[PDB]
């Protein structure tokens, strides 16, 4: 049954919304361009511009190198997709009867193999663009945030936030537009074969997350090598300020914020948005929407996202135009209010979309059967994802902000040395998983009960319906981070660093929240994708108490630990190298420590470049080889276990790692700031307590910036990879069992 909103209306609405989002991004960039600087107080302005250029150059240079390797891997893997999918039906060009309707004829499997390859490359390119554009605005907005900090913490906040909004709206609108275009283009070939249309379109998220994996891990290793090295020798050893221009690692550190926390994060969340959308589309395509060719209801997830962009635009105006920050204590609540307002506004918006873009009754594919579903039930499916997100955001704030007791007790434990700081920090992260898990569990139960895998996929999208705002508050952080780095490097007044420090602490919490959203939506979309895989692979039942499934389960649960071992070890080894280099320069360049000789920044940049480009390979291979090795050797039943295991296990370590690291960072910020008697009693900077906090922070660096956040990609990527390769595994896989 047709919805109120006709198909042509949907066809107009979606790109209009994307255009509006792109326009809004450009406008914000324009407003930020009003902050002027150049390399040609004149001296402070000039110095900021020079440091900005060093950072910009370093960041652009790394991504080109990273993206060159990743893009080569992408072409290699696209060929694998083509051959494996094509081999299912012997590359025949002959049409076959639709698996979703024997009375109809569908396009050849071969076409789906081709178009899956196309959408995969599309997703990879779009994901690269997401990270690059993010890096561009971040490296443009950093120094401008620094200069605005001369006028106060509120002005600086607005520059960093407007700029964060540039990234969020660009990424959400571009991701939406590309998907919309691909669908209309692919439809020209597929015609009424919507099952094949959307199965092919599903490659988009596969490409998105494939590149995101390397961007997150590569970017992650680069930044943490520099970060740990700079901080340990500078702050713990040499008793100099963080980001001091004498420190040879400071440039790599600040470049790192852009290539990891920005570019990597950007590709990462694009993968999230793409997979959730695509997962909804596949299930709907063989549900009544796709069967009755009802375009509007079929594109329900895209309409939700179209409205999300608009909702986030309005929300943004509240922080950008309706409220002023005057005191440091107002930053975190400002940020939180963006999550609150957008959620409330999006609840309404989702109700509107459910009311006008769905028929009141319809059916959803449910493991071979068409399940009767009502539109108010779908509304609750996406709304439960939306509200799970907000809950995750609140709990994550409680655990990572130095405004609350958990982080303050972590800082407090520094009184008894680094070891107690680490014990308290590990305990905090472990403890922090409880409510997000419960939130995710509730979201699963509601959405699974109402609309099976579609409901779940649409819950994932619900959690990411406010993605423009999520990205904005998140990207705000590394920009603020760079601003303090630039302030120190340019020798600005201590008042400037205090303001940036306030901004930066809030970004710590905000980064932990973004990670919570990414993990939450990854669990959701991966479960949806798990169910879809099972159908696509002709599995009747995934029975945990069979030998094949159970070994998959316990092995899948182990993968996130293997992945974490590799990434942690990489950062550890590179940082060890970094410390040796930094020590060397301090110990052997005359005048360096005295400030009359300049350090060699390039050598540190090279160390984090070499380690990242090299060491991103094995964990990337682990994730993407796993479904192929398990699918081909052991078959779809064992692979089923693996998917379930990696999901339920990976999620726990991802959450605890990110929050522990976030907590160590803000525990350190708390001591550095001395904004209360308790904080001051832990100081001043350089005290044993401070140094214990720095130890904790640097241990948390790879936890929250390399392994932790990348785990959500491990999960969601194997999930979509297995779905895309399901027919191939079902037909040609399980060799070990076929032999014996």
Binding site residue list for Mg(2+): 227, 231, 257, 481, 508, 665, 701
User: Out of a second copy, K ion, Mg ion, none, which partner does residue 576 contact, by CB within 5 to 8 A per kind?
Assistant: a second copy
Contact between 572 and a second copy by CB under 8 A: the answer reads yes
Please identify which residue in 12, 26, 544, 621 interacts with a second copy, judged by CB under 8 A: 544
Contact between 384 and a second copy by CB under 8 A: the answer reads no
Residue 216 burial (10 A CB sphere; 0-12, 13-18, 19+): buried
Structure tokens at 535: 């159908």
247 vs 305 by CB, closer to Mg ion: 247
Contact between 652 and a second copy by CB under 8 A: the answer reads yes
Nearest to 551 by CA among 489, 624, 641, 649: 641
Residue 378: enclosing H or E segment and its boundaries?
A: helix 375-400
Structure tokens at 173: 């609108």
Radius of gyration (C-alpha) of the chain in whole angstroms:
25
Question: C-beta of 572: minimal distance to a second copy in Å?
Answer: 4
Contact between 223 and a second copy by CB under 8 A: the answer reads no
User: Out of K ion, Mg ion, a second copy, none, which partner does residue 651 contact, by CB within 5 to 8 A per kind?
Assistant: a second copy
Binding string to a second copy for residues 392 to 431, with x set by CB under 8 A, is what? ---------------------x-xxxxxx-xxx-xxx-xx
15 vs 662 by CB, closer to K ion: 662
Binders in 661-700 for a second copy, by CB under 8 A = 695, 698-699
Whether residue 226 contacts residue 243, with contact meaning beta carbons closer than 8 Å, is answered with no
Contact between 507 and K ion by CB under 5 A: the answer reads yes
Helix (H, G, I), strand (E, B) or coil at 3: coil
Q: List, as residue ranges, the binding site.
A: 224, 227, 231, 257, 481, 508, 665, 701, 704
Contact between 498 and Mg ion by CB under 5 A: the answer reads no
182 vs 654 by CB, closer to K ion: 654
Question: C-beta of 244: minimal distance to Mg ion in Å?
Answer: 12
Contact between 651 and a second copy by CB under 8 A: the answer reads yes
Contact between 477 and K ion by CB under 5 A: the answer reads yes
Structure tokens at 200: 């092919």
Contact between 511 and K ion by CB under 5 A: the answer reads yes
22 vs 511 by CB, closer to K ion: 511
266 vs 308 by CB, closer to K ion: 266
Q: What are phi and psi of 506, to 5 degrees?
A: -65, -40
Q: Quick one: which segment of 11-19, 113-121, 202-210, 641-649 binds a second copy (CB under 8 A)?
A: 641-649
Interatomic CA distance for residues 561 and 17, integer angstroms: 41
477 vs 556 by CB, closer to K ion: 477
Tell me how far CA of residue 284 lies from CA of 24, 214, 659, 689, in angstroms: 31, 31, 36, 56
Question: C-beta of 332: minimal distance to K ion in Å?
Answer: 13
Interatomic CA distance for residues 195 and 282, integer angstroms: 7
Question: C-beta of 426: minimal distance to a second copy in Å?
Answer: 6
Contact between 334 and a second copy by CB under 8 A: the answer reads no
Binding string to a second copy for residues 514 to 533, with x set by CB under 8 A, is what? ---------x---x--xx--
Interatomic CA distance for residues 629 and 621, integer angstroms: 11
Nearest to 145 by CA among 129, 130, 161, 156: 156
19 vs 554 by CB, closer to a second copy: 554
CA atoms within 13 A on the CB side of 586: 23
> Within 10 Å of residue 309's Cβ, how many Cβ atoms?
26
Contact between 508 and K ion by CB under 5 A: the answer reads yes
Alpha-helical (H) ranges within 358-466 are 375-400, 405-412, 418-432, 434-463
Interatomic CA distance for residues 313 and 65, integer angstroms: 34
């Amino acid at each position: 049954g047709a919805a109120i909103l006709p198909d042509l209306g949907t066809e107009i609405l979606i790109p209009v919304c994307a255009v509006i989002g792109i326009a809004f991004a450009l406008f914000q960039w324009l407003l930020v361009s009003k902050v002027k600087l150049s390399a040609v107080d004149h001296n402070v302005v000039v110095k900021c511009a020079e440091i900005q250029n060093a950072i910009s150059e370093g960041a652009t240079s790394f991504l080109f190198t990273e993206y060159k390797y990743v893009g080569i891997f992408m072409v290699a893997f696209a060929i694998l997709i083509f051959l494996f999918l094509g081999s299912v039906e012997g590359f025949s060009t002959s049409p076959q009867a639709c698996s979703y309707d024997k009375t109809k004829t569908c396009k050849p499997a071969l076409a789906t193999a081709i178009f899956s390859t196309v959408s995969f490359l599309l997703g990879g390119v779009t994901s690269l663009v997401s990270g690059f554009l993010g890096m561009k605005i971040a490296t443009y907005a950093n120094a401008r945030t620094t200069l605005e900090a001369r006028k106060g913490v509120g002005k600086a906040f607005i520059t960093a936030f407007r700029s964060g909004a540039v990234m969020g709206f660009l990424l959400a609108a571009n991701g939406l537009l590309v998907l919309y275009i691909a669908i209309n283009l692919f439809k020209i070939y597929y015609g009424d074969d919507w099952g094949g249309l959307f199965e092919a379109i599903d490659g988009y998220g596969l490409g998105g997350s494939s590149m995101a994996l390397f961007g997150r891990v590569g970017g992650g290793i680069y930044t943490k090598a520099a970060d740990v090295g700079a901080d340990l020798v500078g702050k713990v050893e040499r008793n100099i300020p963080e980001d001091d221009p004498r420190n040879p690692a400071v440039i790599a550190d600040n470049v790192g914020d852009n290539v990891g926390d920005i570019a990597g994060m950007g590709s990462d969340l694009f993968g999230s948005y793409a997979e959730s959308s695509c997962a909804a589309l596949v299930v709907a395509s063989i549900s009544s929407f796709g069967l009755n060719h009802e375009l509007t209801a079929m594109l329900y997830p895209l309409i939700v996202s179209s409205v999300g962009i608009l909702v986030c635009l309005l929300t943004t105006l509240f922080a950008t135009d309706f409220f002023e920050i005057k005191a440091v204590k107002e930053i975190e609540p400002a940020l939180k209010k963006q999550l609150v307002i957008s959620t409330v506004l999006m609840t309404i918006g989702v109700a509107v979309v459910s009311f006008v873009a769905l028929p009141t009754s319809f059916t959803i594919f449910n493991f071979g059967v068409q399940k009767d579903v009502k539109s108010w039930q779908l509304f609750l499916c996406v709304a439960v994802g939306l509200w799970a997100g907000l809950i995750i955001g609140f709990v994550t704030e409680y655990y990572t902000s130095n405004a609350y007791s958990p982080v303050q007790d972590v800082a407090d434990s520094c009184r008894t040395g680094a070891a107690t700081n680490v014990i308290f920090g590990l305990a905090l992260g472990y403890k922090s998983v409880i409510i997000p898990i419960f939130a995710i569990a509730i979201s699963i139960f509601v959405s699974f009960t109402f609309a099976a895998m579609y409901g779940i996929a649409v819950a994932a999208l619900g959690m990411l319906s406010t993605i423009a705002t999520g990205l904005a508050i998140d990207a705000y952080g590394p920009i603020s981070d760079n601003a303090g780095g630039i302030a120190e490097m340019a020798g600005m007044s201590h008042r400037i660093r205090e303001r940036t420090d306030a901004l930066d602490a809030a970004g710590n919490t905000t980064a932990a929240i973004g990670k919570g959203f990414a993990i939450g939506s990854a669990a959701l979309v991966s479960l949806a994708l798990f169910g879809a895989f099972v159908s696509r692979a002709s599995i009747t039942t995934v029975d945990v108490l069979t030998p094949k499934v159970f070994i998959g389960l316990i092995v899948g649960a182990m993968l996130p630990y293997w992945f974490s071992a590799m990434t942690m070890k990489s950062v550890g080894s590179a940082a060890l190298k970094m410390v040796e280099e930094v020590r060397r320069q301090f110990n052997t360049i005359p005048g360096l420590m005295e400030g009359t000789a300049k350090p060699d920044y390039a050598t540190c940049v090279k160390i984090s470049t070499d380690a990242s480009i090299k060491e991103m390979i094995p964990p990337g291979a682990l994730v993407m080889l796993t479904p192929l090795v398990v699918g081909i050797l052991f078959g779809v039943e064992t692979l089923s276990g693996v998917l379930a295991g990696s999901l339920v296990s990976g999620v726990q370590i991802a959450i605890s790692a990110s929050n522990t690291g976030g907590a160590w960072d803000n525990a350190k910020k708390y001591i550095e700031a001395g904004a209360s008697e308790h904080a001051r009693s832990l100081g001043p900077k350089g005290s044993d307590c401070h140094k214990a906090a720095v130890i904790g922070d640097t241990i948390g660096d790879p936890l929250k910036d390399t392994s932790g956040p990348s785990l959500n990609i491990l999960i969601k990527l194997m999930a979509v990879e297995s779905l895309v390769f399901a027919p191939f595994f079902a037909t040609h896989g399980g060799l070990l069992f076929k032999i014996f």
